[PDB]
Amino acid sequence: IFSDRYKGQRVLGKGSFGEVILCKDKITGQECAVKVISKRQVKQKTDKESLLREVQLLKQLDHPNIMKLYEFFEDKGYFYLVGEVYTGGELFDEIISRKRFSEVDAARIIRQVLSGITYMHKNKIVHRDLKPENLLLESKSKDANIRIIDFGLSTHFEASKKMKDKIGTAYYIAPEVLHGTYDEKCDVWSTGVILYILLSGCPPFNGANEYDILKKVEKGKYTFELPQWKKVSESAKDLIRKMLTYVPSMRISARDALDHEWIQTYTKEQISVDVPSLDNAILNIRQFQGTQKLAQAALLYMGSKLTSQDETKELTAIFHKMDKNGDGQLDRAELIEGYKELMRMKGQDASMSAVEHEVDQVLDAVDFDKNGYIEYSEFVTVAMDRKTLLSRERLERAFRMFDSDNSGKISSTELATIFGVSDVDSETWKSVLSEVDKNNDGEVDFDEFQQMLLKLCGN
């Protein structure tokens, strides 16, 4: 049983198929990351014979560019996958902060990805959902190793149709995955898409929304027409052509991609080639990452608002039931029990126990002196209306990051892109914008953008 060995320490974030918690071995103090997969929410593809067997194989494999899996647990409601924690964050979030970026830098990155992929394919493990989000760093530095996360998961679990879960996925998926017949070569395609983005800052198959992108992927046509491709070697372009070859049997293997002249030439420890900064690509990749992260932040903000509405209602009912006097005022002990009851009531909560500190932090705000009893109505507000901070601050941070010129505003064209990626219908967000500000002249500030998101989630 998972809880016998590990204690949750803090939430790392939401990943594919479930939340990721930083945990600690109760005996040895070893830190690890655990992915908790809800058996209710997430459908299984294969039998458990197959799932257990793949897990046992993964436990025996080791490669410096693949996330290390340590252990597997299960209960009636969840799977717990335990593995090594990496603290360097996502690759692209590191790249966007660089001032210089060359073909050499791109080559070093892609060689690591290809090395990990080659090793997993040798063991008949396919990723299928390879994308920048699945490339973590061991530290936030251009010199740190890349670790690929989520190999093998898509073989055993079905992806949700929820847009917050499938935002940003269309750019990287192989055409043959869309049509249903795929094998390990799909991972070479996704890596080719990533390389194309590193060298130009723009996806080869681009579009305003999921459908537009997938239509371009399926046709399979892409070009080096953009001006910034003049700064890129023909050798790099040749590798991209081989990796983005449409028919998978004609597409280069990960193993042979590692032997390609570009990889061999540009990953030399000693730089012997020209290294002009791909400056336009850096500007573009910042814009790309920025747009992707703001769209993700927006959907997570709307989700968290809905969740807070539900929890506000459930928490007030709980305290009302506890309030036998009917005076609306409870003490510290009662408030903690009620909050703990809420976290059980909504079964889909994080693995954490964070209530008592939360309670004391709320009480500090509501009644610093701790004279006695607390208006539980006041507590609920401060408990919920502050607990949304994580998503509210993340939304603002994503807005600021996106606004690279510090204009304080997002244009209608940018809104079209952001909402298109977010699966918000054109007429719908324009209608809401009109409701928020009649005299808007094709741009919103942060508050207006926030107001739009609230109207888009029934608030």
Ligand SMILES: CC(C)n1nc(Cc2cccc3ccccc23)c2c(N)ncnc21
């Ligand atoms: C971005 C943040 C949500 N995150 N995500 C991971 C991946 C991860 C963590 C724990 C168990 C896993 C099991 C199977 C596949 C991936 C797993 C991860 C990590 N390893 N380290 C740090 N942060 C991580």
